[PDB]
């Protein structure tokens, strides 16, 4: 419409109904000019870290993280009362757009409105561009609604061939100006809608049974087993006798079972105490990248973090592995710290019921055939892939964690649940790209065929609103005794948690999982 | 609509009809940026003065005071002609909104219009936020229609636990961006309507009878009483005789009565003459807070001011108590004065008919059982709560006084009439919040996930209009002789009262109650 | 329920202390009374209470 | 809290007697009636609509 | 009980001679008499409590 | 404050141990407990106050 | 039973009634070794908060 | 229920189940009980051995 009419309103809510919750988030954004209106190819040849790609002039909106859409109170209502969650529909608006001229004259900068400038926006619905939004990276909305955020710069990668960055004929370039975009002046606004595909509910419960205890404790099995090959308590001694017995109540380690625990790949275990670790450098041939479990893709090492879902240490335990996601509090300065008290540790220990431990093993296998002259021998199974009859539990979603990931486009995949948590989606929520339209500066009055390198310095601000419809399963359980609940236990504090501080800073001092309520196997 | 079209008009009126008066007030406001767009938690640990809470970036409109809605002539028409008053409906408009850029270059500031900036507005109709508007505080509209006022900054408190400010798990934080707001550019306007719940009329009359004189002076009672236990005029002397008599006309202190005066809690009495007071310091262990009647809430002292409704001294009397509200004239400088001539004293003395005096007592009680060997003894009743059969009169409303208060949300309450005067309301007129939308400054051209700390300096101005429908009860009394009226008695003046002065200042030099007309019990 | 104590008198003259009808010691003083604008009023009957 | 229901950022327009004397001590100093506006930060002195 | 007792402080009690109404009280009105008044006019006032 | 101070009379305060309800009070009821009673019968009486 | 759901706009998390009991030889709120059912805590109803 | 480590002690995640907390039919000698069920679609078991 006009320059003096607002093209949208501020909406932040959570609306709760039966089997349904709708969240709406509104933020203020600022968009700079990226790469001085240029596409730049980027890439470094650095062993395993070798990459190549392009940084675009464009930018994109990332809401992918849960604390974007929920207050800490709403996250509490969700995880205390409900067994399951999943997204249903989505709507995004971009409005109240303001383009700013910035001028420097005497050495000090002034800002004015440019009323005739445009900003370009398009959503990629058909996924024709590389999808970077699921990578677990910064640029998501700030969790606190009053904070203003910079729109992140868009860029992508391409095939790395070996450890060298040089491109081959299979590398692709993508110009985003080669897409239809809407162009918006201050009166214009943008809107797009999306439908989530049907996906299994996330499990917001922990199991109240163990996979190996699923039996009736009062009863014997009708199955029989070999109890011993000899009399007495000692190995390689006594009389050789095959002793069979009915499998009685009270020895439940010997019970025949229908199901097996899930897959495992062992992780290296580290201590939060510096004195209990061996001394492993960050770089060199002995670098810690070497001694963590890694995968090799085309000759390059990649840390297997988090990896397949596995039980891990408690968040307050001394030991930890790469199977645990780590978040930071405010206290660190400069992206490095020597103290674990400044970090937020994630624990999967809830799934220790159905899942093998991350740092222990799947089990121990008998690797020979014993006989009268051959003693039995066992080896550890450190990594055991999936076998018929296994059941397992996924990693938990976190309030600081990602909501979804895009299932890679491949003909094979197995159990397409993202390993950092959340909802695997063949077609995920689309990326919405935004750039400032270049405004040339004062040109030469004689013609040149050279491209224009000279531009007015500009940036834009505006409002973005995301609405997500969530489907929730309420807990119907018949458990008699009270559940674990997520509560505020923090006690007496100089400054409230989950609130702004003395100086106006909003920090998240805890990591909150979704698993409080329980369910039986 | 547009930038060149006004979105509202100036309306200031009082419209008088039968049983009805409608007031309309229009003011010009200015809204700054508060806390540099931040939420700040605030709190000091100071014994009884310990508090905690948050100051918001937002602001809110307060019309709660009577001189906002009435001219001194309209207040006169009301209180001379009418026995009763109460609000009925309300409508608020906010319009003609102007956002200003302010720039500093050479050391001197310039102001320009920013046509694309917005201001955010919402009314909290469902009372989900702490209601601060009834607290008897500054930020109400100026009584004089030509004056421009700053919009007050919004903030709230929370539970104080003991005398320490530290928060517990019961303290709540409130983000106002977590509410749906309308966003307004210069062409946009805002409107909201409200209905008052049914409330008893305020009594604009004083009683022309005394609670203890309600009898017929010409007649005896048929009741009998014990006149004396002895002959003669002296205590503990004479012959012991039980003497009974009919209760005759002319002794009206002995008459049996159906009703009792209201409740009392004694106040300390102070003199406006410095030499007639004992010397009581402002601070220390002997501080005046100690020797005023106070209440203890969770260990903290609070002055009981005004307290329950009680008769008090005349506004021109030497003595005064905390039961009297005090207003200031212009003369004081620096929020302190040693002279009472600069203040406006409020008097409740009209209610001395039905109410016990604030500084005297409810009465005197017989605290023993006398007998031949035991002399009778009496004690003062300083504080007597309500007993069946009491009747009382509320504190009066003042032209400088608050119109309403929000009845606290609690399961018990008794006679929910605000103690500073006015209309107790379960659902009061809503708070209407307003803030300037942050406009980021020139950002960095490389991405950072840090929040934006850099902002264009802005403020907004505009117009606000409040319309209240009032219901009034006209006086029908059969009194033969003339009433007391509120009049201009001021005599010959160098400068008119209730008018601007030589230099253009508008001051209120008197405090005007509502009680002039009389009514019989 | 609520209470405000009353002075108790005997119908037997010898069991009462000697209280005159008038004066500064007058019986109006030693009965429970209320003060309204400085005046004493006997609190008779007063709030409902069990009695003899 | 019932006694904190106010806005912590704002003063009342009400005035009160702060002290009857100069100095920090009882029964000492010069006898002076000192009045002041009731400022933000002393919330024990605020006039209130409700009682516990 | 008007104090707080402790190992060094003996407990002390005072009489409640006049106690106003508190939440949870129940009471009975005075009786009507054959020689007594039938009605009274409730005073015209904005407050009153249990207008019997 | 149980007296009236003056130049020759120091101020004096007493404790209010029992204070009945006065106009303008607000209060909160006792909480219900999982081991606690659900209801009570309001006594049959002509007066009662806040029958919780 | 009729229940009112909490609609509050509080940003930060509430206090909740939870099982905090930790590691136990015998579960609380469950029968014991010998078949006895005991209640080892007293549970009020007040966890959630509301502003005045 | 969940075994935590090699120790039997329960944690807060252990659940108790009272079966009297379910609706039951009660039967005297003349009464009888009946219930029906539908299997979900499942692959046939293979009752053959492979000849290749």
Numbering used by the authors:
A (entry chain B), B (entry chain A): 222 to 742
C (entry chain G): 483 to 534
D (entry chain I): 431 to 482
E (entry chain G), F (entry chain I): 587 to 638
G (entry chain I): 691 to 742
H (entry chain J): 379 to 430
Which of the paper's sentences describe this entry?
Adeno-associated viruses (AAV) are single-stranded DNA packaging viruses of the Parvoviridae and belong to the genus Dependoparvovirus. The virions of the AAVs are composed of non-enveloped capsids with T = 1 icosahedral symmetry and diameters of ≈260 Å. They are assembled from 60 viral proteins (VPs): VP1 (≈82 kDa), VP2 (≈73 kDa), and VP3 (≈61 kDa) in an approximate 1:1:10 ratio. In this study, the structures of the AAV7, AAV11, AAV12, and AAV13 capsids were determined by cryo-EM in an effort to complete the panel of available structures for the defined AAV serotypes.
For AAV11 and AAV12, the closest related AAV serotype is AAV4 based on VP1 or VP3 amino acid sequence ranging from 78 to 81% aa sequence identity. In contrast, major structural variabilities (vs. AAV2) were seen in VR-I, VR-III, VR-IV, VR-V, VR-VI, VR-VII, and VR-IX for AAV11 and AAV12. Most notably is the 5 aa insertion in VR-V for both AAV11 and AAV12, relative to AAV2, but also to AAV7 and AAV13. In addition, both AAV serotypes possess a single aa insertion in VR-IV and display a different conformation to the other AAV serotypes with the apex of the loop positioned over part of VR-V. This subloop of VR-V and the alternative conformation of VR-IV are responsible for the broader appearance of the 3-fold protrusions of the AAV11 and AAV12 capsids. For AAV12, HSPG and sialic acids were excluded as a receptor, and no binding to the available glycans on an array was shown. An interesting difference between AAV4, AAV11, and AAV12 for AAV vector production is the requirement for the assembly activating protein (AAP) for capsid assembly. While AAV12 is dependent on the presence of AAP, AAV4 and AAV11 are not. While the VP structures of empty and full capsids were largely identical, some alternative side-chain orientations, e.g., histidine 230 (AAV7 numbering), were observed. In the AAV serotype structures determined in this study, the histidine side chain preferred the “left” orientation in full capsids. In contrast, both orientations are equally adopted in empty capsids, except for AAV12, where the right orientation appears to be favored.
